[PDB]
Amino acid sequence: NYRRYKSVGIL
Amino acid sequence: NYRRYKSVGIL
Amino acid sequence: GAMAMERASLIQKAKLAEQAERYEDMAAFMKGAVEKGEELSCEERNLLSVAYKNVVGGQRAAWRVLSSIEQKSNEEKGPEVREYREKVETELQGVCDTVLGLLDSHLIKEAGDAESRVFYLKMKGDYYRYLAEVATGDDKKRIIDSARSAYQEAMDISKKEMPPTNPIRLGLALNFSVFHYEIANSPEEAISLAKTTFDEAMADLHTLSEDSYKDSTLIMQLLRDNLTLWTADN
Amino acid sequence: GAMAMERASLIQKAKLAEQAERYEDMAAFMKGAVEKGEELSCEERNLLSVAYKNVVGGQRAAWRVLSSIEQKSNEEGSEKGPEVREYREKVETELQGVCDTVLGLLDSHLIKEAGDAESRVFYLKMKGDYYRYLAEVATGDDKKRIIDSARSAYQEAMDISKKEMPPTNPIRLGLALNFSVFHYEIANSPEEAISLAKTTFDEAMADLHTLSEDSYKDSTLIMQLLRDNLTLWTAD
Ligand SMILES: C=CC(C)(C)OC[C@H]1O[C@H](O[C@@H]2C3=C([C@H](C)COC(C)=O)C[C@H](O)[C@]3(C)/C=C3/[C@@H](COC)CC[C@H]3[C@@H](C)[C@H]2O)[C@H](O)[C@@H](OC(C)=O)[C@@H]1O
Ligand SMILES: C=CC(C)(C)OC[C@H]1O[C@H](O[C@@H]2C3=C([C@H](C)COC(C)=O)C[C@H](O)[C@]3(C)/C=C3/[C@@H](COC)CC[C@H]3[C@@H](C)[C@H]2O)[C@H](O)[C@@H](OC(C)=O)[C@@H]1O
Ligand SMILES: [Cl-]
Structure with a gap:
């Protein structure tokens, strides 16, 4: 998922 | 996975 | 309750x-x-x-x-x-x-409709088949024979009591043909079962009800895909 | 041995x-x-x-x-x-x-006093991240305790990163990004999250010509994630 902003990650 | 033929489970 | x-x-x-x-x-x-x-x-x-x-x-x-x-x-x-x-x-x-x-x-029981009895016997063949994928010793033959007997009893019920387009019958025939190919190393039986299954389903394709069309046609696709792969190799 | x-x-x-x-x-x-x-x-x-x-x-x-x-x-609905x-x-x-x-x-x-800045920041960011994941699911007095612990961990990693690492180092960028998510999502401090993300991207933008090829891809990916979060947080 419901979250548009991202944390560090490759996908 | 390396198996090319398929069983029902793939669905 | x-x-x-x-x-x-x-x-x-x-x-x-x-x-x-x-x-x-x-x-x-x-x-x-x-x-x-x-x-x-x-x-x-x-x-x-x-x-x-x-x-x-x-x-x-x-x-x-x-x-x-x-x-x-x-x-x-x-x-x-x-x-x-x-x-x-x-x-x-x-x-x-x-x-x-x-x-x-x-x-697994002797009662119940044909669908339920075939469903669980196919499951029994499938999990014996998964055991057979990894078996290496003097138990490998027993495991393969147990898979085959389950698949065979399910096959017998499905051809006696269910139409050729029934998804459970079709999925059983698909997985039994994979057993023939990969486990029993009998590519001719695998090709022949897949082809007969696909041919007999095609013949009733035009009558297939909506509640079953999706499942049946998906399995028919898999049957045909396996055939194309298995036959071109041989 | x-x-x-x-x-x-x-x-x-x-x-x-x-x-x-x-x-x-x-x-x-x-x-x-x-x-x-x-x-x-x-x-x-x-x-x-x-x-x-x-x-x-x-x-x-x-x-x-x-x-x-x-x-x-x-x-x-039931x-x-x-x-x-x-x-x-x-x-x-x-x-x-x-x-x-x-x-x-x-x-x-x-987590140790010894070791280069990358290692020390790497593990203190991890500590902050896993407290942040505990805060995602916590409530009440527990949530406050966990949120304090995450901020402390991230802040310690920040102070090391801003002191000992280039603005374009991927671990530094990754830390800032995740801290800004903490601010936005966990602490309910969008201004702080936007301030940190904006400053991080901008100070990295300047030193881009110096960026190396080994970490080029790592840093790029993170800077893009910073930009997208900013795009969303500014329009909201
Ligand atoms: C986990 C269950 C859910 C996801 C709810 O259903 C799985 C699926 O359950 C049913 O489909 C079955 C079903 C299969 C269909 C081919 C899936 O169809 C679609 C459209 O995705 C594959 C599944 O593994 C399952 C349950 C298994 C088998 C297989 C079991 O052998 C022991 C025999 C053939 C096949 C039969 C039983 C299918 O009827 C339905 O007809 C499907 O369609 C809908 C819309 O319900 C549904 O996706
Ligand atoms: C050791 C192998 C694996 C686990 C597959 O490596 C994961 C990745 O390992 C390195 O990248 C790291 C790494 C990530 C990169 C930014 C991903 O880059 C791309 C282009 O996909 C994301 C990963 O989660 C990881 C390990 C995490 C972090 C983060 C950890 O916080 C504690 C801080 C920022 C970032 C750093 C440590 C990156 O350097 C590499 O630079 C990446 O690229 C190559 C080409 O190796 C590789 O995909
Ligand atoms: Cl092990």
């Missing part, structure tokens, strides 16, 4: 685990639901089979990756790969034994 | 688990390798972080699916009953146990 309420809770949690893609939890929830005594509805059968299929499917994929590395093992040729492959294998075997144990104690 | 042999075996099994996508196994192998007492190389640190990230990321996603169902169900809350708590408890294991390992073996 001691079991009635608890059983319905377990079914509700299996459906939640499904949506969350928590297939280990889903399988355990459906196993508890079975052991409450009642027979499964069509929808419940599907939850059970999908749950355990996804569980063993991850183990089988892992086992295949590892077994392949094990066969090419050369810069560090130590016991690491065999050890970890044996761990995954033991885990996979334990799941297959749980499912087979549940089929034999609660689900 | 024996220690080095055992450690190399565990690292090798960790890589086999990775190829098999057995991330629980992979995490435990890397935990065992950590407990042999030797510091982790750059590559080994990434193996540890990815294994646990995959484990907890599966649980976080599942937990969000159940929380969403749990709300709609309680709207009188998935009425405690099943959804009971199962969501089972997933929550498992996730808390993994975060607890990771946090414990960071404190018992990995």
Whole structure:
């Protein structure tokens, strides 16, 4: 998922 | 996975 | 309603685990639901089979990756790969034994409609087949014979009591042809069963009801795909 | 000797688990390798972080699916009953146990005064991240305690990174990004999250011509994630 902003990650 | 033929489970 | 309420809770949690893609939890929830005594509805059968299929499917994929590395093992040729492959294998075997144990104690019965009897016997062939994928010793022949006997009894019921387009009949024939090809190493039987199944389903394709069209046609696609692969090789 | 042999075996099994996508196994192998007492190389640190990230990321996603169902169900639609809350708590408890294991390992073996700035920032960011994951699911007085712990961990990693690392270092960028998510999502401080993300991207933008090719891809990916979060947080 419901979250548009991202944390560090490759996908 | 390396198996090319398929069983029902793939669905 | 001691079991009635608890059983319905377990079914509700299996459906939640499904949506969350928590297939280990889903399988355990459906196993508890079975052991409450009642027979499964069509929808419940599907939850059970999908749950355990996804569980063993991850183990089988892992086992295949590892077994392949094990066969090419050369810069560090130590016991690491065999050890970890044996761990995954033991885990996979334990799941297959749980499912087979549940089929034999609660689900396989002489009563019930043809669909239910074929459904569970196909499951029995499938999990014996998964055991056979990893078996190497003097038990391999017994395991293969057990898979074949289950698949054969299911085949006999399906051709006697169900139409050629029935999805369960079709999925049984597909998986039995994979057994012939990969496990029994009989590519001619595999090709012949897949072709006869696909041919006989095509002949009733025009009559297929909507509630079954999707499932049937998906399995027919797989049957044809396997045929194209198996025949071009030979 | 024996220690080095055992450690190399565990690292090798960790890589086999990775190829098999057995991330629980992979995490435990890397935990065992950590407990042999030797510091982790750059590559080994990434193996540890990815294994646990995959484990907890599966649980976080599942937990969000159940929380969403749990709300709609309680709207009188009727998935009425405690099943959804009971199962969501089972997933929550498992996730808390993994975060607890990771946090414990960071404190018992990995967080140290010694070592280069990258290593020290790497592990203090991890501590902040896993407290942030515990805060995603916590409530009440517990949530406050956990949120304090995350901020403290991130802040300590920040102070090291701004003092000892270039503005374009991927670990520094990754830290700032995740701290700004903490600000936005957990602390409910969008201005702070926007301030940090904006400053991080801008100060990295300047020193881009100096950026190296080894970490070029890493830094680029993170700067893009910073930009997208900013795009969203500014229009909201
Ligand atoms: C986990 C269960 C859910 C996801 C709810 O259903 C799985 C699926 O359950 C049913 O489909 C079955 C079903 C399969 C269909 C081919 C799936 O169809 C679609 C459109 O995705 C594959 C599944 O593994 C399953 C349950 C299994 C089998 C197989 C079991 O052997 C022991 C025999 C053939 C096949 C049969 C039983 C199919 O009827 C339905 O016809 C499908 O369609 C709908 C819309 O319900 C549904 O996707
Ligand atoms: C050791 C192997 C694996 C685990 C596959 O490596 C993961 C990745 O390992 C390195 O990248 C790291 C790394 C990430 C990169 C930014 C991903 O880059 C691309 C282009 O996909 C994301 C990963 O989660 C990881 C390990 C995490 C962090 C983060 C950890 O916080 C504690 C801080 C920022 C970032 C750093 C450590 C990155 O350097 C590499 O630079 C990446 O690229 C290559 C080409 O190796 C590789 O994909
Ligand atoms: Cl092992």
